[PDB]
Structure formats: structure tokens, C-alpha cells
Design a binder for this molecule. Structure first.
Ligand SMILES: CC(C)CCC[C@@H](C)[C@H]1CC[C@H]2[C@@H]3CC=C4C[C@@H](O)CC[C@]4(C)[C@H]3CC[C@]12C
Ligand SMILES: CC(C)CCC[C@@H](C)[C@H]1CC[C@H]2[C@@H]3CC=C4C[C@@H](O)CC[C@]4(C)[C@H]3CC[C@]12C
Ligand SMILES: CC(C)CCC[C@@H](C)[C@H]1CC[C@H]2[C@@H]3CC=C4C[C@@H](O)CC[C@]4(C)[C@H]3CC[C@]12C
Ligand SMILES: CC(C)CCC[C@@H](C)[C@H]1CC[C@H]2[C@@H]3CC=C4C[C@@H](O)CC[C@]4(C)[C@H]3CC[C@]12C
Ligand SMILES: CC(C)CCC[C@@H](C)[C@H]1CC[C@H]2[C@@H]3CC=C4C[C@@H](O)CC[C@]4(C)[C@H]3CC[C@]12C
Ligand SMILES: CC(C)CCC[C@@H](C)[C@H]1CC[C@H]2[C@@H]3CC=C4C[C@@H](O)CC[C@]4(C)[C@H]3CC[C@]12C
Ligand SMILES: CC(C)CCC[C@@H](C)[C@H]1CC[C@H]2[C@@H]3CC=C4C[C@@H](O)CC[C@]4(C)[C@H]3CC[C@]12C
Ligand SMILES: CC(C)CCC[C@@H](C)[C@H]1CC[C@H]2[C@@H]3CC=C4C[C@@H](O)CC[C@]4(C)[C@H]3CC[C@]12C
Ligand SMILES: CC(C)CCC[C@@H](C)[C@H]1CC[C@H]2[C@@H]3CC=C4C[C@@H](O)CC[C@]4(C)[C@H]3CC[C@]12C
Ligand SMILES: CC(C)CCC[C@@H](C)[C@H]1CC[C@H]2[C@@H]3CC=C4C[C@@H](O)CC[C@]4(C)[C@H]3CC[C@]12C
Ligand SMILES: CCCN(CCc1cccs1)[C@H]1CCc2c(O)cccc2C1
Ligand SMILES: CCCCCCCCCCCCCCCC(=O)O
Lengths: 279, 338, 57, 238
């Protein structure tokens, strides 16, 4: 009784937080023509749609099965495995696409202003969703993923291959892109700091802002996903870890989906539109 | 020595301060006391004309109440059908830095100018249909701030050179110039009869001119600061003004003084543009507040707000038949209201 | 120096603007009253027409 | 649909105009707009003529196209206006940069140039526009210091206190007096620019002579830095 009530409350709160945060991002874009004109928002709304699908399609049914201790939705279990792999992959691939947009903008500023368009933004998003659909649906419907209860266990080849495409390649791209952004930001901060120092000298710490922003972005993403993706490789290969431990790290992966709208969409232009809508 | 002329000027001002106070037997706010106020003017956007790349910096209605010109600092002047939202023409300007445009009472011609110091006239109804420059009115020694056609062969312009001028379009030269303003002349409006016009300037004054006498007839000075916009009240006997002062003021051509002032403690930024509804009952004003306030012209109560813009409201115009207001902005959109 | 002619022309402007005839503020205001009340019945921003009459619906 | 032949012609005309606008939008993004400012003595007129290797007189603005590394720049010189700037400057709310030119050899005029820079920098409508300073006629500054006339302190008494930044990079064989002078005047504009604007706009100083063929390369390099810092602020990395 007590642990059933506690887990029901906590999972309900986590679902509602994930739902509300991603709904606010979708509510802000539709009413705001300047937000729609800024290309970077196409990615931030695509991320919020991915995270909204995690909240509607996936988390609630697993929460019910965790409080119940059994799975009621039997034919839906095969569909739910595809929904989870797709929207979990789509959420990761949207973060990877946001890093490549930010890196292109900072790395090649004239070529970005010239070649970046609503067509280019929409093609990048369309490929992230396409790849998340292809990896999930074709393997699940062809029954390539599998080698009352819902069987979420995976074939060794599919588990490793799916982890490379969905996580280990996109985290390698995020590490390279954010590392090069840090080096470019350090060059500009040295230049600014030199002129500020000369002005103070003649009249007679900012690097921590860069480190804080990038350490939140990489720290939250890697902390939630890396424990899950390591276990996801180990467990089918061993066929090594207690199922309770696996279920908590699964819930950390979806918890990142609730943090995604906080990290990406709390910028002052969105924050104004939220305040203007809410009153 | 000069000083007898300063003494005469000071005593002439003392006489006219007294003469205006001798006319001041009442106020509009007093005699308005029994008037039933207008209802809350809940106007809404009925079209959004989009296609300009940069900030829209001026617009003007056709006398037909269908067609609009507007100008933006990307160097396009666009002609719009307000009912169907069709683009009837788009004209590439030779200078990007346009600051005004105007459209002839016949619909035959459009004019525009800006930092090039030139007014360029475009013929819309040329034989081959592909529109081109009819003439360029060079001769101002500062940027053009405003243009208005009196007819297809007469245009009045104001300039940063502190003057206004009247031109003959066929000759391509000034046939009168108006020179009593000091500092930059910002705004300009013909009277309904086209025999008088008013202008406002950075001297914080407005002046009344006769189009064919070529001289100043009255001067008005109620603003504490720079005047960005001016408009005649539809009867032709009064006009409103708007300024960096954060105030509108209404003046009468026979009382020779401020008849009313429009202000509220919530507004502290400049007024960019003004206009009246067809009866004169409403005064509509655009702001650096990203929105337009609508004022009861007699009471000076805020009767409503138009809130649909993301950046500075640069221009504002009521249709010649009163059926709509269009408002342009630095966000690059035109919105039409009822 | 030319400031004599500038101050003289200014005094001529102030004479011309002084000599103009003027009217009581009460009469000036009453003309604006009469013009508003005569035309307010025909001013569609005060009193919205139905979407059948309005080309802007 | 209900279109007559007239409505069809109006919609077809509209779609042709929209095709033209959509093509010209590429040109409007593919170019950078620059406002060129500076007093009568500044030499801005010789800088703009010397840039034309990279490409009526009574009209109120002049325009120069140039390109560097296949990026287009339009540079606007406002001239034949009145000397009161405060109104026409609002057009330039959206240029990539202001280029501001100073004659470094005129100690009499240099406080006017500092006052003129201060009113550009603190302008309500320029709150996001970064300034490229060209500290021009560096040859004449070298001549007026190497002549031994020893007079900057008559105009600027803090030049008796001031000593050269360790961040300074003098050219080979430049005299310590010339170096202390050129960095002193630079640091007066840095005194003004660093006091306001909270990283929303930055000042980019250069030492130059109008004959420098490097000047278009200096504009390109600073526009690249101006856009990088602008992108870095959107993401809160500045
Ligand atoms: C079922 C899956 C594939 C749905 C994924 C959601 C996609 C289609 C959504 C998420 C964000 C959305 C974009 C958000 C903002 C804009 C800018 C606007 O000016 C044009 C539409 C456009 C470009 C939207 C198109 C649709 C979009 C890309
Ligand atoms: C974009 C999002 C919101 C669309 C969501 C569509 C959902 C509700 C649809 C898509 C596929 C559907 C499932 C497809 C197949 C089956 C097996 C059947 O024996 C029971 C119903 C069940 C389990 C369906 C339930 C509803 C379902 C999950
Ligand atoms: C295994 C997965 C992670 C592979 C997909 C990698 C991600 C980062 C993909 C998704 C969409 C892709 C982009 C799609 C389109 C273009 C435009 C082209 O002119 C340059 C490359 C660029 C910008 C692509 C770079 C890589 C990209 C951003
Ligand atoms: C859209 C593409 C790029 C996504 C990657 C698809 C990967 C995961 C697919 C492509 C081919 C697949 C394999 C094809 C055939 C079989 C035999 C079956 O008895 C067990 C699974 C297994 C071994 C599949 C595992 C998953 C697999 C490796
Ligand atoms: C794209 C690049 C940078 C990614 C590099 C890391 C990849 C290759 C790593 C990360 C986690 C790793 C897996 C973690 C655990 C196991 C179980 C072990 O009994 C066999 C190897 C196996 C299956 C590993 C294979 C390689 C692996 C998938
Ligand atoms: C597995 C890991 C190591 C792979 C890392 C791949 C990295 C280097 C790739 C992935 C996406 C790539 C970017 C995608 C798009 C563009 C825009 C193009 O106009 C210039 C190159 C640029 C900016 C690419 C540079 C290299 C890039 C950042
Ligand atoms: C497979 C994944 C999970 C491995 C994660 C390894 C990460 C933490 C490593 C790999 C490369 C590393 C970076 C390499 C280079 C630099 C530039 C330096 O000036 C600051 C540190 C920084 C930015 C490093 C931080 C740590 C780093 C990002
Ligand atoms: C519980 C789940 C969601 C995991 C959350 C882990 C997050 C909150 C952790 C992981 C890495 C952490 C960051 C690592 C390094 C730094 C740099 C330091 O100078 C300030 C704190 C800061 C910025 C940390 C803040 C908290 C952080 C972002
Ligand atoms: C938080 C991020 C940055 C780093 C994550 C590091 C990874 C390698 C850590 C985090 C938690 C760890 C797991 C915690 C508990 C157990 C149970 C034990 O019986 C076998 C090992 C196993 C399954 C661990 C394997 C390694 C692990 C997955
Ligand atoms: C800052 C926010 C996003 C952090 C969210 C913390 C999340 C990941 C925590 C809070 C409460 C946790 C749950 C509490 C109890 C149980 C019961 C156990 O038998 C399986 C795991 C499960 C269901 C946990 C999964 C992880 C969980 C949902
Ligand atoms: C947050 C993790 C959600 N799921 C875990 C599903 C469950 C297994 C056991 C109990 S619940 C993974 C399944 C595998 C996979 C993958 O191969 C690639 C990309 C995403 C995912 C999502
Ligand atoms: C607007 C109310 C909240 C959101 C309800 C819909 C959530 C699912 C669909 C969101 C993505 C589609 C909208 C993207 C924006 C756009 O098309 O302009």
C-alpha cells in the first residue's frame, strides 16, 4: 500500500511536469510570429514534441504497470515497444541536431546566415524523426528486436546496433560540437578581456559562464542517458543486473525529457511569451 | 546693435500670450462634461499583409479605400489590394533608405524619398504596364521626411534641411518654399480643401502655411519636445500632434492654442504617428510602446488599444471612407483593423 | 552682419501672426462638438457594421 | 474555386511578385550593411576611395559595394545632411556595424571625436550596434610625436600619468613615445565603450592609414567576430 501510493504520486508528478513543460513550448511558438521566424525555434519545438510524445505515448502506461506489478495492455505491449524506441530516439536525435545547428552558427557565421532557411531547418528535423521511426518500427514490426508481462528484452545484435545509432554516435557528435564551441568562445573571451583590462588599467571569471552553460547541457544529458545505454548493452550480452536497477535507470532516461524544455526553452524570448500567455 | 528687434519680438510674444489667454474662456474638457463617452473600441486584426524584408517605415491609403502603398528599408515600395491581400505592384527603389511614401488622389502616381534627399515619382498606369520613374525632384539639402500630393502635378515635401517645398511635377522644380521652421521638419498634412497645410518639427512647434501665399500664418508651441506626427481633424478647423514628449495635443486654428491634451501615467515613450476616424470622434496614435492607443478625441479617455505588433509602430492611417485603419511596424508586417 | 535681417524677418513673422483674428475657446470647442455629433452615425470605427456590409468581415 | 478571369489575373500577378520578392530575399541576407561615420578631418573619404579596389553628388547618401572572401558588404557614407544627427540615425537600427573614423593627429579635435563617439555609443536606437574604430593617419601621429613637440599633455593631462599596456603589440622599430601616444588615445575610446552596454555591443579598435589595402580585411575579420559574439549571446555563452 504505502510504496504503491508513493510511486503513483511521484510518477504522476513526473508525467505532468513533462507534459506541462513541453505543452508550454508548443503554446508559445504557435502565437508568436517572431519565434516562428527565428530558425533555431524549429528545433526547440521539435525537441518539445518528442518529449511530449514520451509523456503521452510511453511514460503513463509503464507507470500503471509499475504500480500494478503486472502488464494489462497485451497487444499494445508490441506497439508500446515501438513508441518508446522511437520517441526516446527522437528526443536524443533532436538534442544532437540542436548541437549541430549551434556549431554551424558559431563556426561559420556568414555561411550560416546565407544558407540557413526554414527549408533547411525542416530537413534537419525531418531526418531526425525519420531515423527514429526507421530504427524503431521496421525492427519491431519485422520482430528483429526480440530474440501478465510485457517482454522488453532485446536481441544482442539489435541492442548494440540500436544503442550505437540512437546514443553513442549522437553523444560523440555532441562532444565534438560542444568542445569546438568552447574553444571558439574562449578565443572571443580572451579578446574581450584584453580590451576590458586595458580600459581599467588606463582608468586607474566570464569563462565560468561558458563552463556552467555547457556543463548543464552535457552534464544532464550524459548523466541520464549514459547509465541506461551501458546497461542496455550489458544485459542482453550477459544473457548481469537486477531488474529493479534497470527500471530506475530507464526512468532517468525519460526524466531527461522533462529537463529538456527547462534547459533549451527558458531563454528570455520564450520566457517573455510564457509570461504574456499566462498573465 | 540688434537688440531693438529682440525687444520687439519679446513684446509681440507677450501680446500673443495675452491674446490667447483672452480667448481662453473655457476648455474642451469642461464643455465635454455632458457628452456620453464612446463604448470600449474592441477592434481586431482582419488582414496581415506580409512580404517586406526590412522594417516598414511609411504607408498611405488610396482614395478608393482598396489600395495601399508601403515602403521598407530593404528598398521595395509595395502596392497591396487590402480586400484580397494581393500584391498589385512591387517597385525596386534606387536608394534603400526610404523614409516616406505617398499615393496620388487619382491613383495614377506614387511618390517616395528619404536619405538620398530626392523625391521619386512613379507612374502606375504607363502604357507597357511595367512601372518606372516619371521624375526625380532633387533640390532639398537634407533627407525627405514627408510627401503629399495636392494633385497629379503638385506635391508638397518636408525635409531635414528645415524647409518645406511645393513642386510642379511636369517642370521638376520648386514653385514655392517654406522657411520659418528651425530644426528638422518631421511631418506634414494637407487641409481637406488643399489650400492650407500644417507641419511639425524638431523646434517642438507646429506651423500653418498657405499653399499659394507661400507664408506661415500661425505658430503653435505646446509640446515641451520634438514633434514626430501631425494630422488635420476632418472638419479642417483643428489638428492633432504627436511627439517624443509622450503626449498628443489638439489645436484649433481660431482659438490659436492647445484645445486638448492626451496623456496617461503608463506611457513614457514617443508617439510616432496619429490619425482621426471619419467623424473626428476617435484619435488613433502609434507608439514606441509596440502598440496603438485609441483616444476619445473630446474626453481624452483611452477608448481602446491595438496590440498586434512585435516592434515599433512606425506608421498608421485610417481609410478615406473610415472603413478601416492600417498600421505598419519595424516588425515588417501591416495589420488592418475593425 | 546678416543676423539683423534674420531678426527683422522674424519680427515681420511675429507681426503677421499677431494680427490674425481669434475666437473664444467655447465657440471653437462647440464646432468640434457639432461636427462629431453630425457624423458619428456614419463613422464605422465607433459603431461596427455587420459582416455582410463590412469588406473586412 | 470561384475565381473569375480578373481574380485569376490578380492572383497570378501576386504569385509572380512573390516569386521576385522570394529571389531578392536571398540577396538581402547575402550582404552586410555598414554605416561609415567620422568628422571632416577624419579621412573617411580617402578610406572609402581606397576600398574600391575590392568593388548626383548633392544626394544625401553615398553607397560603396565591396566583397572579401565571397561575402558582400554595402557601406553607406551619410553626407550632404545637416550636422544634427539625432533623427536620421534611427534608420541604422539594423546595420552589421558602424565604422567610426578618427584623425589621431588632431589633439584639438580629439575631444570632439570622443564626444561624438560617446553620443553614438549611448544612443537609444543603437543599443545593439558594435563600432569598428579606425584610428586613422597613424603616420601623421608618428610625425607629430617624432618632431619632439611634446604637447599631448596640454590637451590631456592624464598623459603625464599614463603608461603603455603589456597587451600592446607595437610594429618593428616603432618609438616608445609613438607607442605610448597611439595606445593612450585608443584607450580613451575604450574608457567610453567599456563603461556601458553590458556585452550587448562591443568596440573594435584598429590603427590605420587611409592607404592600407588591409582595411577591407579588417572589416571582414571584425564582422566575423561581431556575428560570432551575437550567436554566442543567444545561447548564453556570453
Ligand atoms: C509525427 C512526427 C513526424 C511529428 C514531428 C513534429 C514536426 C512535424 C513539427 C515540430 C516543430 C514544427 C515546426 C515549428 C515551427 C515552424 C515555423 C513556421 O514558420 C513554419 C512551420 C514550422 C517549420 C513547424 C512545422 C512542423 C514541425 C517541424
Ligand atoms: C501522434 C500520436 C498521438 C498518434 C497515436 C495513435 C495511437 C493511439 C494508435 C496507433 C497504433 C494503434 C495500435 C495498433 C494495433 C493495436 C493492436 C490491437 O489488437 C489493439 C489496439 C492496438 C494496440 C492499437 C491502439 C491505438 C494505437 C496505439
Ligand atoms: C546516427 C545519427 C546520429 C546520424 C545523424 C546525424 C545528425 C547530426 C544529422 C541529422 C540531419 C543532418 C543534416 C541534414 C542536412 C544537412 C545540410 C547539408 O548541406 C550539410 C549537412 C546537414 C546540416 C546534415 C548534417 C548531419 C545531420 C545534422
Ligand atoms: C534504418 C537503419 C539504418 C537502422 C539500423 C537497422 C539495424 C538495427 C538492423 C538492420 C538489419 C537487422 C538484422 C537483420 C536480420 C536479423 C535476423 C533475425 O533473426 C535477428 C535480428 C537480425 C540480426 C537483425 C538485427 C537488426 C538489424 C542489424
Ligand atoms: C561512436 C563511438 C565513439 C562509440 C564508442 C563506444 C561504444 C563502441 C561502446 C560503449 C559501450 C560498449 C559496450 C558496453 C558493454 C558490453 C558488454 C561486453 O560484455 C561486451 C562489449 C559491450 C557490448 C560493449 C561494446 C562497445 C560499446 C557499445
Ligand atoms: C562519431 C563522431 C566522432 C563523428 C563526429 C562528426 C562531426 C565532426 C560532424 C557531424 C555534423 C557535421 C557538420 C554538419 C554540417 C555542417 C555545415 C557545412 O556547411 C560545413 C560543415 C558542418 C559544420 C559539419 C562539420 C562536421 C560535423 C560537426
Ligand atoms: C562516450 C562518452 C560518454 C565519453 C565522455 C568523455 C568526455 C567527458 C571527454 C572527451 C573529450 C574531452 C574534452 C577534450 C578537450 C577539451 C578542451 C579543453 O580546453 C577543456 C576540456 C575539454 C572540453 C574536454 C572535457 C572532457 C571531454 C568532453
Ligand atoms: C538527477 C539527474 C537529472 C542528473 C542531473 C545531474 C546534473 C544536475 C549535474 C551533472 C554535472 C553537473 C555540473 C558539473 C560541473 C559544473 C561546473 C561548476 O563550476 C558549477 C556546477 C556545474 C555546472 C555542475 C552542475 C550540476 C550538473 C549539471
Ligand atoms: C553518471 C554518468 C556520468 C556515469 C555513469 C557510469 C556508469 C558506467 C555506472 C553508473 C551506475 C553503475 C551501475 C550501478 C550498479 C550496478 C549493480 C552491480 O551489481 C553491477 C554493476 C552496476 C550495474 C553498475 C555498472 C556501472 C554503472 C552503469
Ligand atoms: C529533476 C527530476 C526530473 C528528477 C526525477 C527523478 C526520477 C527519475 C525518480 C523519482 C522517483 C523515482 C521512482 C521511485 C520508486 C520506484 C519503484 C522501483 O521499484 C522502480 C523505480 C521507481 C519507479 C523510481 C524511478 C526513478 C524516479 C521516477
Ligand atoms: C529510457 C529507456 C527506454 N527503453 C527501455 C525499455 C524497457 C526495457 C526494460 C524495462 S523498460 C529503451 C529500449 C531500447 C532503446 C534503444 O535500443 C534505442 C533507443 C532507445 C531505447 C529505449
Ligand atoms: C496549442 C495547445 C498546446 C499544444 C497542443 C498540440 C500538441 C501536439 C502537436 C504539436 C506540434 C504541432 C504544432 C507546431 C507549430 C506550428 O505548426 O505552427
Amino acid at each position: 500500500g504505502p510504496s504503491q501510493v508513493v510511486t503513483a504520486c511521484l510518477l504522476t508528478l513526473l508525467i505532468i511536469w513533462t507534459l506541462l513543460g513541453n505543452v508550454l513550448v508548443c503554446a508559445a511558438i504557435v502565437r508568436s510570429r517572431h519565434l516562428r521566424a527565428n530558425m533555431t525555434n524549429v528545433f526547440i519545438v521539435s525537441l518539445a514534441v518528442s518529449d511530449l510524445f514520451v509523456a503521452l505515448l510511453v511514460m503513463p502506461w509503464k507507470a500503471v504497470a509499475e504500480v500494478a506489478g503486472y502488464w494489462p495492455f497485451g497487444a499494445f505491449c508490441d506497439v508500446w515497444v515501438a513508441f518508446d524506441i522511437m520517441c526516446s530516439t527522437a528526443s536524443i536525435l533532436n538534442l544532437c541536431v540542436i548541437s549541430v545547428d549551434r556549431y554551424w552558427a558559431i563556426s561559420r557565421p556568414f555561411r550560416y546566415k546565407r544558407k540557413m532557411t526554414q527549408r533547411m531547418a525542416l530537413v534537419m528535423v525531418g531526418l531526425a524523426w525519420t531515423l527514429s521511426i526507421l530504427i524503431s518500427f521496421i525492427p519491431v514490426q519485422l520482430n528483429w528486436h526480440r530474440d501478465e508481462n510485457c517482454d522488453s528484452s532485446l536481441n544482442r545484435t539489435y541492442a548494440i546496433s540500436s544503442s550505437l545509432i540512437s546514443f553513442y554516435i549522437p553523444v560523440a557528435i555532441m562532444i565534438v560540437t560542444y568542445t569546438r564551441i568552447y574553444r571558439i568562445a574562449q578565443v572571443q573571451i580572451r579578446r574581450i578581456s584584453s580590451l576590458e583590462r586595458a580600459a581599467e588599467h588606463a582608468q586607474s571569471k566570464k569563462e565560468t559562464k561558458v563552463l556552467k552553460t555547457l556543463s548543464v547541457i552535457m552534464g544532464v544529458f550524459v548523466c541520464c542517458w549514459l547509465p541506461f545505454f551501458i546497461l542496455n548493452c550489458m544485459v542482453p550480452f550477459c544473457s548481469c543486473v537486477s531488474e529493479t536497477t534497470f527500471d530506475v535507470f530507464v526512468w532517468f532516461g525519460w526524466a531527461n525529457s522533462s529537463l529538456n524544455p527547462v534547459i533549451y526553452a527558458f531563454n528570455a524570448d520564450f520566457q517573455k511569451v510564457f509570461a504574456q500567455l499566462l498573465g | 546693435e540688434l537688440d531693438q528687434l529682440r525687444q520687439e519680438a519679446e513684446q509681440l510674444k507677450n501680446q500673443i500670450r495675452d491674446a490667447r489667454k483672452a480667448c481662453a474662456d473655457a476648455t474642451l474638457s469642461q464643455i465635454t462634461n455632458n457628452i456620453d463617452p464612446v463604448g470600449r473600441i474592441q477592434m481586431r486584426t482582419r488582414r496581415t499583409l506580409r512580404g517586406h524584408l526590412a522594417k516598414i517605415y511609411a504607408m498611405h491609403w488610396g482614395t478608393d479605400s482598396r489600395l495601399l502603398v508601403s515602403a521598407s528599408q530593404d528598398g521595395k515600395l509595395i502596392i497591396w489590394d487590402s480586400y484580397t491581400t494581393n500584391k498589385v505592384h512591387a517597385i525596386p527603389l534606387r536608394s534603400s533608405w526610404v523614409m516616406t511614401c505617398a499615393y496620388a488622389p487619382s491613383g495614377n502616381y506614387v511618390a517616395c524619398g528619404g536619405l538620398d534627399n530626392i523625391c521619386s515619382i512613379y507612374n502606375l498606369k504607363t502604357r507597357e504596364g511595367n512601372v518606372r520613374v516619371s521624375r526625380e525632384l532633387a533640390g532639398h539639402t537634407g533627407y525627405l521626411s514627408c510627401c503629399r500630393f495636392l494633385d497629379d502635378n503638385q506635391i508638397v515635401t518636408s525635409s531635414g534641411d528645415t524647409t518645406c517645398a511645393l513642386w510642379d511635377i511636369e517642370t521638376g522644380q520648386q514653385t514655392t518654399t517654406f522657411t520659418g521652421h528651425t530644426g528638422d521638419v518631421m511631418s506634414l498634412s494637407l487641409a481637406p480643401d488643399t489650400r492650407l497645410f500644417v507641419s511639425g518639427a524638431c523646434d517642438a512647434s507646429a506651423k500653418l502655411w498657405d499653399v499659394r501665399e507661400g507664408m506661415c500664418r500661425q505658430t503653435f508651441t505646446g509640446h515641451e519636445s520634438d514633434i514626430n506626427a501631425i494630422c488635420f481633424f476632418p472638419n479642417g478647423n483643428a489638428f492633432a500632434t504627436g511627439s517624443d514628449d509622450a503626449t498628443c495635443r489638439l489645436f484649433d486654428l481660431r482659438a490659436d492654442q492647445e484645445l486638448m491634451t492626451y496623456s496617461h501615467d503608463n506611457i513614457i515613450c514617443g508617439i510616432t504617428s496619429v490619425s482621426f476616424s471619419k467623424s473626428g470622434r476617435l484619435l488613433l496614435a502609434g507608439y514606441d510602446d509596440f502598440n496603438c492607443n485609441v483616444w476619445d478625441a473630446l474626453k481624452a479617455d483611452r477608448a481602446g488599444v491595438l496590440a498586434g505588433h512585435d516592434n515599433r509602430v512606425s506608421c498608421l492611417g485610417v481609410t478615406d471612407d473610415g472603413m478601416a485603419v492600417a498600421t505598419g511596424s519595424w516588425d515588417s508586417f501591416l495589420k488592418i483593423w475593425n | 552682419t546678416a543676423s539683423i535681417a534674420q531678426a527683422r524677418k522674424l519680427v515681420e513673422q511675429l507681426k503677421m501672426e499677431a494680427n490674425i483674428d481669434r475666437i473664444k475657446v467655447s465657440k471653437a470647442a462647440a464646432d468640434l462638438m457639432a461636427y462629431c455629433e453630425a457624423h458619428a452615425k456614419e463613422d464605422p470605427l465607433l459603431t461596427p457594421v455587420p459582416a455582410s456590409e463590412n469588406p473586412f468581415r | 474555386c470561384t475565381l473569375s478571369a480578373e481574380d485569376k489575373a490578380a492572383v497570378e500577378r501576386s504569385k509572380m511578385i512573390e516569386k521576385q520578392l522570394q529571389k531578392d530575399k536571398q540577396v538581402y541576407r547575402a550582404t552586410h550593411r555598414l554605416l561609415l561615420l567620422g568628422a571632416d578631418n577624419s579621412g573617411k573619404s580617402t578610406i572609402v576611395k581606397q576600398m574600391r579596389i575590392y568593388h548626383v553628388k548633392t544626394s544625401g547618401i553615398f553607397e560603396t559595394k565591396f566583397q572579401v572572401d565571397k561575402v558582400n558588404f554595402h557601406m553607406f557614407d551619410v553626407g550632404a545632411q545637416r550636422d544634427e544627427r539625432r533623427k536620421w540615425i534611427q534608420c541604422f537600427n539594423d546595420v552589421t556595424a558602424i565604422i567610426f573614423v578618427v584623425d589621431s593627429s588632431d589633439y584639438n579635435r580629439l575631444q570632439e571625436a570622443l564626444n561624438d563617439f560617446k553620443s553614438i555609443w549611448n544612443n537609444r536606437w543603437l543599443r545593439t550596434i558594435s563600432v569598428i574604430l579606425f584610428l586613422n593617419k597613424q603616420d601623421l601621429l608618428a610625425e607629430k610625436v617624432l618632431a619632439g613637440k611634446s604637447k599631448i599633455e596640454d590637451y590631456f593631462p592624464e598623459f603625464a600619468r599614463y603608461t603603455t599596456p603589456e597587451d600592446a603589440t607595437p610594429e618593428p622599430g616603432e618609438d616608445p613615445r609613438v607607442t605610448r601616444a597611439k595606445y593612450f588615445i585608443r584607450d580613451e575610446f575604450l574608457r567610453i565603450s567599456t563603461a556601458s552596454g553590458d556585452g550587448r555591443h562591443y568596440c573594435y579598435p584598429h590603427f590605420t592609414c587611409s592607404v592600407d589595402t588591409e582595411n577591407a580585411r579588417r572589416i571582414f575579420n571584425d564582422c566575423r567576430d561581431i556575428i560570432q559574439r551575437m550567436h554566442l549571446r543567444q545561447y548564453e555563452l556570453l
